Write a protein that binds this ligand. Structure first.
Ligand SMILES: CCCCCC/C=C\CCCCCCCCCC(=O)O[C@H](COC(=O)CCCCCCCCCCCCCCC)COP(=O)(O)OC[C@@H](O)CO
Ligand SMILES: CCCCCC/C=C\CCCCCCCCCC(=O)O[C@H](COC(=O)CCCCCCCCCCCCCCC)COP(=O)(O)OC[C@@H](O)CO
Ligand SMILES: CCCCCC/C=C\CCCCCCCCCC(=O)O[C@H](COC(=O)CCCCCCCCCCCCCCC)COP(=O)(O)OC[C@@H](O)CO
Ligand SMILES: CCCCCC/C=C\CCCCCCCCCC(=O)O[C@H](COC(=O)CCCCCCCCCCCCCCC)COP(=O)(O)OC[C@@H](O)CO
Ligand SMILES: CCCCCC/C=C\CCCCCCCCCC(=O)O[C@H](COC(=O)CCCCCCCCCCCCCCC)COP(=O)(O)OC[C@@H](O)CO
Ligand SMILES: CCCCCC/C=C\CCCCCCCCCC(=O)O[C@H](COC(=O)CCCCCCCCCCCCCCC)COP(=O)(O)OC[C@@H](O)CO
Ligand SMILES: CCCCCC/C=C\CCCCCCCCCC(=O)O[C@H](COC(=O)CCCCCCCCCCCCCCC)COP(=O)(O)OC[C@@H](O)CO
Ligand SMILES: CCCCCC/C=C\CCCCCCCCCC(=O)O[C@H](COC(=O)CCCCCCCCCCCCCCC)COP(=O)(O)OC[C@@H](O)CO
Ligand SMILES: CCCCCC/C=C\CCCCCCCCCC(=O)O[C@H](COC(=O)CCCCCCCCCCCCCCC)COP(=O)(O)OC[C@@H](O)CO
Ligand SMILES: COC(C)(C)C/C=C/C(C)=C/C=C/C(C)=C/C=C/C(C)=C/C=C/C=C(C)/C=C/C=C(C)/C=C/C=C(C)/C=C/CC(C)(C)OC
Ligand SMILES: COC(C)(C)C/C=C/C(C)=C/C=C/C(C)=C/C=C/C(C)=C/C=C/C=C(C)/C=C/C=C(C)/C=C/C=C(C)/C=C/CC(C)(C)OC
Ligand SMILES: COC(C)(C)C/C=C/C(C)=C/C=C/C(C)=C/C=C/C(C)=C/C=C/C=C(C)/C=C/C=C(C)/C=C/C=C(C)/C=C/CC(C)(C)OC
Ligand SMILES: COC(C)(C)C/C=C/C(C)=C/C=C/C(C)=C/C=C/C(C)=C/C=C/C=C(C)/C=C/C=C(C)/C=C/C=C(C)/C=C/CC(C)(C)OC
Lengths: 49, 49, 47, 46, 46, 45, 47, 46, 46, 49, 49, 49, 49, 49, 49, 46, 45, 46, 47, 49, 49, 49, 49, 49, 49, 49, 49, 49, 49
């Protein structure tokens, strides 16, 4: 809430797509980390068969 | 550094930076809000915790 | 607001409601027919 | 309730409703096809 | 009901109808082909 | 952007196509029902 | 609309319908021949 | 309570309400479908 | 129905129809070739 | 920030951005609509759930 | 629906292809994740033999 | 946004965009058409389905 | 068919090669995914020996 | 044969090297895919010893 | 869109695009022709098929 | 049929034909070499 | 962009080529049928 | 039926016909070669 | 159309057809010779 | 605290996004290093099942 | 090198660089503060140490 | 020998280094493909011991 | 100490971030090398359980 | 397209392109010539063939 | 090469390069100083040495 | 020796660093290829212990 | 010692950081090659435990 | 193409290219000379050959 | 090519290039000097040789 002027020195054309893409990348890495380190997440994919 | 009319290196004035950051913060809160409900669903319906 | 007069909005609404009621009436009949085939509200003993 | 159409574009509302209805009907029909009781083409016996 | 074409573009609606019904018809034919009672090419007993 | 008469012409083509399309569809479903009904009874087909 | 007159559109439509009916007529005869070989509508007992 | 629409935009609130309740209704229906006592399609004994 | 040709380009419609017909005929012929009953070149016996 | 004629840093006016975003949202809804039908097919015909 | 002004600071020439490509990348990753963590998705490929 | 003569940010007029997109759609249909015949060959001659 | 104005904001010099290359990339990934998750596709390569 | 004006919107300085290099990339991938999924192609390299 | 003298965004006139694409098609045919002989050699002298 | 040469460049048609013929002859000769009956250099015995 | 007479010339070349192509195709199929018919009976070929 | 060439370009149609029928003829010949009853090079009994 | 006169197109066509017939005549003779070696049309009993 | 003049020679438009992204990259690498080299962090993902 | 008005190669004056770095240091301290509480939670509730 | 005017549309400053580098990449890939799919090429490295 | 004029030919806007980032990369590689080639560093992560 | 003096988009005249391509072809033949001797050495002294 | 006022290719004068490099050396010494204490802690409390 | 005019069309600023770096890359690959496909090169590293 | 004029055609702003970084990359690769192909270098990391 | 004064697209005159290529060839020969002695040492002191 | 005042394509005069290369060579000798002592330490205290 205090860093509104981060956008005065960082171009939003590069700051915003980088921020949103990086947030999504974190989500994929967390999803992937749990998928490869649990049995239940692959089992949720597997289902009844 | 409170000039409403100055155009900073990023190509934005200070009011434009404040308005842009507000969408960034509002976007984060909505993302965090959906994440929290996602986490409690993960708590309630996954072996986690 | 969009470029629609009070009269055009009133004319669209009357047709929209009429079309909705016909769509619902067909669905209601379809549901009555489907109930006659197999009811979807189980009793205390199940199906 | 007719004032709703001055606020919202009647064309875009119709597309949204028809899109929602098409999705919902497909969801319901295929949910039924997956059931043992309401799978009509599968020869379901009660 | 001719007033529908003052709201939705008849140009796009016709094309979307033919493509949409093409997909719908193929889906239903293929779904029936995947069944044992309505696969007319396989011809299982009913 | 569309006049009243032009909408009549579009609907006239639509009504002719819809009538033929559904009329063939209804006849097709009567034939399909005569072949193998798709609504099972309590014991199946 | 495309740069086509009422007469050109009428002339195309008459040929289009005639060509469609010939394509269908050949297909209908082909389907009659295919039926004579092996019918594709099974009976209650199957094939 | 009409004064709410001088604070919140009625344009966005209605759209958000219909989408938000659409998600909420689907969630509750699916949660009930996942239970053994309220899955009306499965029809387990109560 | 001739007014359809003022709305749509007759050349593009013919190519779309011929493309659809060519694809459909190939689909039906090869579906039949996969069947045990309608595979003519495979010496299918009923 | 409601100037129809101003050309923002991205090279668009506000009405142009509104029109572009509407195609983005309509595209998303069509994508989401197809995805939902794809998911129910995945529910109905795959071991999932 | 509220972020139509994202396209005033982010150039659509880069925002749009990034968005569409990243959405497709998510789809591929989800497809690949299920493919490598189920038996039925490989079995769907395998078929009768 | 129906100006035939305006040169949009991409460097194209609207009629030029319409003509280019028609080749994109025609290219897609031919690609999809060949794909469908490819899929039925895959259905007919591979263990799939 | 409705998005012909995608080419007014996205430069075709970058949109078209990205689109065609990405479509090819999808095809390669699908070909590779089936190749690594079936026995018949490697066997088709293998042949009689 | 109908796409000659692809080169009016895509710069040949980038379209042509991309096209030729990507065609070569497909050839390498197909060669590699067969090499890793057959016994005879490695055996062709192996020879009599 | 049939102006022989106009210079399009790619830096080419239409006649220059037609001439360039002709080399592209002639290149593809020669490549495809060599591939076909290569494939039949692969059919004749490899376990494939 | 001589009007075909005003429509199509006679040089490019000759190249396409000769290229097609060269490819076809290689295809047929090597298909025959792969056969047990028509492999002449392989000493094929009927 | 095409005159009536120019379309006649195009169709004249088309009709000549189509007639020869189909005529050879029909003869080829008669010969192929005489060799091995491709429509099996109930018991096969 | 000469009017067809006022709609479809006879220049492109001829080239597309020769390429398309080239592919179709190769497909049919190869499909026959893959069968046991119509592979004239293999010459299995009919 | 390409820069070819009716006379040049007629002159090319006569040579093209003559060259085609010679190419086919050699091919026909080659096929007659190949048939004498081993016929490629199997009988009902095979080869 | 003494390096405020790092931003006189390094452009903040590139220094700041690189710094923040790199800090996040460190966090992911440390998270990943512990995840792949412990049993309890995967067990925390696994939970009761 | 204490000129308030000089615009250095990065596009900033010295006062602007000092102000930017203060947000950098304040951001780091908050990050370090959250990290320290995260580490003690890791100490208290994980097998570490 | 017929494509000398490939260099009128493709800049030699990028066409030539790409061509030579790609040719070398092919050579390395072929060398590597044989190395990993034979016993004699590693044995040639191994020598008498 | 003798190379102060390295910054007269190498731009600090690229030399400094490259230097600091590369130093961090070395630290990560050393940390990773020891982590993957010892038992005690993974055991330090593992702790009492 | 036979203007010796025109400077094409690549920055070359037609005679300059012809001279450049001659070195490309002469380089290719020398490369192919050395490859052919390399191959026969590979045939003669390696288990290949 | 001892001109205080000349602006070198990097965009710096010699005194600016000297001042920048001093922070680089001071940064290195602090980094090295912390590293040495880190190493002795590694010596004292890890199985190393 | 005959290609001195390669540097008239290829910029030395990009041709020379690419050439030298690529030569080093070949050297690393050859070193690495022998290292991973022999026992004596790893044994040379191993020494007496 | 004879190549001082390499810096007349190669820009030092790119030649120098490439050179230094590449030298470091060689050092890391040599360190990594020995680490993964010896027992004593991992044992030096392992120490007494 | 023998103009000593013309400045070609690479930014070099023909004499400048000749002088640059001479250092390239002299560099190659020295590299080849050192490589040959390296190879004979590899022959003399490694199991190779 | 011995003009002290000419500014070559890299942005340097010949004396500037000579001075820059001297730091490069002096840097290499120090690097080589440290490397030689590192090697003898590796010889003396590692199983190598
Ligand atoms: C991985 C799974 C999830 C990933 C999802 C997507 C995440 C990241 C993708 C990339 C993020 C968006 C990058 C957009 C960069 C271009 C934006 C832009 O437009 O930046 C422009 C220049 O950027 C420039 O040079 C610099 C442009 C290069 C920036 C590249 C940044 C590095 C790559 C991203 C790394 C992300 C983390 C690693 C993930 C693998 C400046 O903007 P304008 O004011 O218009 O200036 C106009 C001038 O440029 C005209 O000459
Ligand atoms: C063009 C489209 C045309 C398609 C028409 C299909 C309409 C439904 C088919 C008609 C069903 C008639 C009765 C079927 C029947 O015969 O089912 C009988 C009971 O049916 C009963 O009471 C009543 C059974 C009703 C079946 C359930 C129908 C539910 C859906 C109705 C239509 C929905 C969509 C409507 C849109 C216009 C008993 O079954 P048996 O096989 O005797 O048991 C042995
Ligand atoms: C992986 C499986 C699915 C993937 C599918 C494809 C997904 C992503 C591919 C890349 C997405 C499209 C990127 C297009 C970027 C260029 C568009 C563009 O044109 O951006 C231009 C500049 O971009 C610039 O510098 C910056 C240009 C560089 C941008 C690079 C972004 C990072 C790479 C993408 C990362 C995606 C996530 C990671 C995936 C592994 C600005 O536009 P204009 O207003 O015309 O300005 C004109 C001036 O530039 C002229 O000097
Ligand atoms: C993987 C198997 C199949 C892959 C097949 C190939 C697929 C993708 C390869 C890359 C696709 C083509 C990219 C071409 C981009 C450049 C085209 C271009 O020309 O874009 C130009 C700028 O692009 C710019 O900055 C931006 C230039 C950088 C764009 C980089 C995009 C990211 C890389 C592609 C990622 C694809 C998905 C991931 C695949 C692994 C703008 O065009 P003009 O109007 O002429 O402007 C003139 C000005 O530039 C002059 O200064
Ligand atoms: C140029 C193309 C030329 C191609 C021509 C092929 C046309 C079909 C071949 C002719 C079939 C004649 C009857 C075959 C037959 O003799 O089949 C007999 C029964 O078929 C019967 O009544 C009649 C069964 C007819 C076979 C089924 C044909 C279906 C398709 C017809 C044509 C479709 C396309 C038409 C396009 C113009 C019995 O079989 P037997 O072997 O005695 O059993 C032992
Ligand atoms: C991995 C998991 C977490 C990752 C999270 C994300 C981390 C890193 C992603 C990249 C970090 C952001 C990079 C943004 C760079 C562009 C910003 C920018 O805008 O830089 C501009 C130029 O950048 C330029 O050339 C150069 C632009 C290219 C810079 C590329 C830097 C290398 C790539 C990043 C490497 C990160 C470490 C490795 C991670 C795998 C300069 O700014 P302005 O003053 O406006 O100048 C205007 C002029 O450009 C107009 O022509
Ligand atoms: C792998 C094992 C063997 C590998 C060996 C090496 C092979 C390939 C390495 C790269 C090949 C050389 C690339 C050189 C590109 C720069 C040349 C150049 O100079 O291209 C210049 C611009 O290129 C531009 O932007 C855009 C330039 C983009 C070039 C990047 C291309 C993608 C990377 C190469 C991919 C190779 C294949 C994949 C290998 C893994 C144009 O030239 P000029 O007329 O001077 O214009 C002057 C203007 O630019 C001034 O603003
Ligand atoms: C890996 C784990 C730890 C990693 C941590 C991070 C390490 C490295 C990340 C990258 C390091 C920072 C790169 C910043 C480069 C951009 C800075 C910059 O701004 O450089 C600018 C140009 O950079 C340019 O072309 C060149 C831009 C591209 C440079 C990219 C260099 C290759 C990528 C870095 C490789 C590092 C080692 C490999 C690690 C994977 C020039 O500066 P100015 O004086 O403003 O000129 C203004 C003009 O540009 C305007 O047109
Ligand atoms: C791997 C483990 C150790 C790695 C350590 C680090 C090693 C390498 C990292 C990269 C090396 C430094 C690259 C810096 C390049 C930018 C420097 C620069 O500043 O180059 C500038 C342009 O560079 C340009 O385009 C081109 C800029 C892009 C150059 C990218 C080179 C390829 C990437 C490096 C590959 C290294 C080897 C492979 C490593 C895995 C030119 O300089 P100036 O005279 O100011 O011109 C001003 C103009 O540009 C303004 O418009
Ligand atoms: C004036 O302006 C004019 C009109 C000129 C410009 C107009 C331009 C036009 C015509 C533009 C057209 C735009 C279009 C076509 C827009 C289309 C938009 C679409 C298709 C949007 C679709 C969006 C879909 C989204 C955003 C889906 C997101 C999904 C997410 C984020 C899922 C994440 C999943 C995760 C993280 C799960 C991970 C789990 C595992 C481990 C499985 O994943 C690897
Ligand atoms: C006026 O303009 C002037 C004349 C000045 C410019 C002219 C310039 C010139 C002379 C230009 C020359 C142009 C050239 C030489 C063009 C050459 C074109 C070529 C060689 C085209 C060849 C094309 C080949 C193609 C497109 C092949 C495509 C193959 C595809 C798409 C295969 C895909 C396969 C898949 C997806 C299979 C995957 C399966 C597995 C898993 C095995 O793959 C990994
Ligand atoms: C006038 O100028 C003004 C004042 C305007 C500009 C001033 C700007 C400012 C304030 C600049 C600030 C600059 C700073 C903060 C500079 C900081 C410099 C630092 C922190 C330098 C630290 C250097 C540390 C170094 C170089 C460490 C190097 C380590 C090396 C090379 C280790 C290599 C190890 C290897 C190769 C080992 C490999 C073994 C294994 C296998 C384990 O590796 C994977
Ligand atoms: C007027 O101009 C002035 C004078 C101002 C500019 C002058 C500038 C100066 C002083 C320039 C200096 C230039 C220099 C120093 C040039 C140096 C050139 C060198 C060192 C050339 C060395 C060349 C070595 C070569 C090209 C070696 C090539 C080796 C190849 C291609 C090997 C390929 C091997 C393969 C493909 C094997 C693969 C097998 C396995 C599987 C093992 O590989 C992975």
């Amino acid at each position: 809430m205090n860093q509104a002027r981060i956008w005065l020195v960082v171009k939003p054309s590069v700051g915003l797509p980088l921020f949103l893409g990086v947030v999504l990348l974190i989500s994929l890495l967390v999803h992937g980390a749990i998928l490869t380190n649990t049995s239940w997440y692959p089992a949720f994919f597997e289902g009844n068969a | 550094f409170d000039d409403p009319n100055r155009v900073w290196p990023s190509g934005l004035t200070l009011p434009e930076a404040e308005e842009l950051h507000s969408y960034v913060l509002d976007g984060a809160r909505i993302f965090f809000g959906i994440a929290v409900v996602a986490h409690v669903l993960a708590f309630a319906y996954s072996p986690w915790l | 607001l969009t470029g629609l007069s009070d009269e055009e909005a009133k004319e669209f609404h009357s047709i929209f409601m009429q079309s909705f009621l016909i769509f619902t009436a067909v669905a209601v009949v379809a549901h009555f027919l489907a109930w006659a085939w197999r009811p979807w509200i189980p009793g205390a003993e199940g199906y | 309730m007719w004032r709703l159409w001055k606020l919202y574009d009647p064309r875009r509302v119709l597309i949204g409703i028809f899109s929602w209805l098409a999705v919902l009907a497909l969801v319901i029909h295929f949910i039924l096809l997956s059931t043992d009781r309401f799978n009509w083409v599968g020869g379901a016996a009660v | 009901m001719w007033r529908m074409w003052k709201i939705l573009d008849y140009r796009r609606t016709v094309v979307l109808a033919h493509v949409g019904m093409a997909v719908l018809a193929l889906l239903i034919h293929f779904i029936l082909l995947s069944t044992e009672n309505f696969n007319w090419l396989q011809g299982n007993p009913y | 952007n569309v006049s009243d008469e032009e909408a009549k012409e579009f609907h006239a083509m639509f009504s002719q196509a819809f009538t033929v399309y559904i009329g063939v569809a209804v006849v097709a479903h009567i034939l399909a029902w005569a072949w193998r009904p798709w609504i099972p009874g309590d014991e199946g087909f």
